[PDB]
Amino acid sequence: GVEIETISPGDGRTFPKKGQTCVVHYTGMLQNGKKFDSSRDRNKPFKFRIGKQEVIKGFEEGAAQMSLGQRAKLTCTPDVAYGATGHPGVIPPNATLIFDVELLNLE
Amino acid sequence: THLRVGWALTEGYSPYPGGGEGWGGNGVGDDLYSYGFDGLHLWTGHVA
């Protein structure tokens, strides 16, 4: 279950075309308030192509719902993202995730 | 970047730039004595 709440407005018409890389900035944190990753800390825009299973399926679906130049807070159901066993030492098992993604560029 | 608008008490609200409470950077909405919101969501008692 993904809930794409809009942190800020972004051009509604633009939407991620299928089979295209999406340049994003994301700051993922746990439900209780612990922050585990921040793309801004890496100082590089994370790149991923839609239609592949490289990223979490919930994250890809939320990015598909997202629009260019628009930031949103979206929550990923633990069953979707690392349900049975989480990423070792990063996400505990059966724990929900919260993201904050900006779709700066699509090229 | 952080920007809150709201009101506060004269005694309970004591911002000390530093650790504060929770994750740090406590603003007007973080203090339970004070009341304020930032854009989409309101802030009371350091919870959104």
Swiss-Prot record, chain A:
Residues 19-107 form the PPIase FKBP-type domain. It is an enzyme of class 5 (isomerase). It holds the Pfam family FKBP_C. Detected in heart muscle (at protein level). Isoform 1 and isoform 2 are ubiquitous with highest levels in brain and thymus. Its EC number is 5.2.1.8. InterPro entries: FKBP-type_PPIase, PPIase_dom_sf, PPIase_FKBP_dom. It catalyses: [protein]-peptidylproline (omega=180) = [protein]-peptidylproline (omega=0). GO terms for biological process: 'de novo' protein folding; calcium-mediated signaling; insulin secretion involved in cellular response to glucose stimulus; negative regulation of calcium-mediated signaling; negative regulation of heart rate; negative regulation of insulin secretion involved in cellular response to glucose stimulus; negative regulation of release of sequestered calcium ion into cytosol; neuronal action potential propagation. GO terms for cellular component: calcium channel complex; cytoplasm; membrane; sarcoplasmic reticulum membrane; Z disc. It is found in: Cytoplasm; Sarcoplasmic reticulum. Its main location: cytoplasm. Identified in a complex composed of RYR2, FKBP1B, PKA catalytic subunit, PRKAR2A, AKAP6, and the protein phosphatases PP2A and PP1. Interacts directly with RYR2. Has the potential to contribute to the immunosuppressive and toxic effects of FK506 and rapamycin. PPIases accelerate the folding of proteins. It catalyzes the cis-trans isomerization of proline imidic peptide bonds in oligopeptides. This is Peptidyl-prolyl cis-trans isomerase FKBP1B.
UniProtKB/Swiss-Prot annotation, chain B:
Detected in skeletal muscle (at protein level). Fast- or slow-twitch skeletal muscle. It is found in: Sarcoplasmic reticulum membrane. The N-terminus is blocked. Homotetramer. Can also form heterotetramers with RYR2. Identified in a complex composed of RYR1, PDE4D, PKA, FKBP1A and protein phosphatase 1 (PP1). Repeated very high-level exercise decreases interaction with PDE4D and protein phosphatase 1 (PP1). Interacts with CALM; CALM with bound calcium inhibits the RYR1 channel activity. Interacts with S100A1. Interacts with FKBP1A; this stabilizes the closed conformation of the channel. Interacts with CACNA1S; interaction with CACNA1S is important for activation of the RYR1 channel. Interacts with CACNB1. Cytosolic calcium-activated calcium channel that mediates the release of Ca(2+) from the sarcoplasmic reticulum into the cytosol and thereby plays a key role in triggering muscle contraction following depolarization of T-tubules. Repeated very high-level exercise increases the open probability of the channel and leads to Ca(2+) leaking into the cytoplasm. Can also mediate the release of Ca(2+) from intracellular stores in neurons, and may thereby promote prolonged Ca(2+) signaling in the brain. Required for normal embryonic development of muscle fibers and skeletal muscle. Binding of [3H]ryanodine indicates that the heterozygous channel is activated by Ca(2+) concentrations 4-fold lower than normal. Single-cell analysis of cotransfected cells shows a significantly increased resting cytoplasmic Ca(2+) level and a significantly reduced luminal Ca(2+) level. The calcium release channel activity resides in the C-terminal region while the remaining part of the protein constitutes the 'foot' structure spanning the junctional gap between the sarcoplasmic reticulum (SR) and the T-tubule. Pore opening is mediated via the cytoplasmic calcium-binding domains that mediate a small rotation of the channel-forming transmembrane regions that then leads to channel opening. Belongs to the ryanodine receptor (TC 1.A.3.1) family. RYR1 subfamily. This is Ryanodine receptor 1.
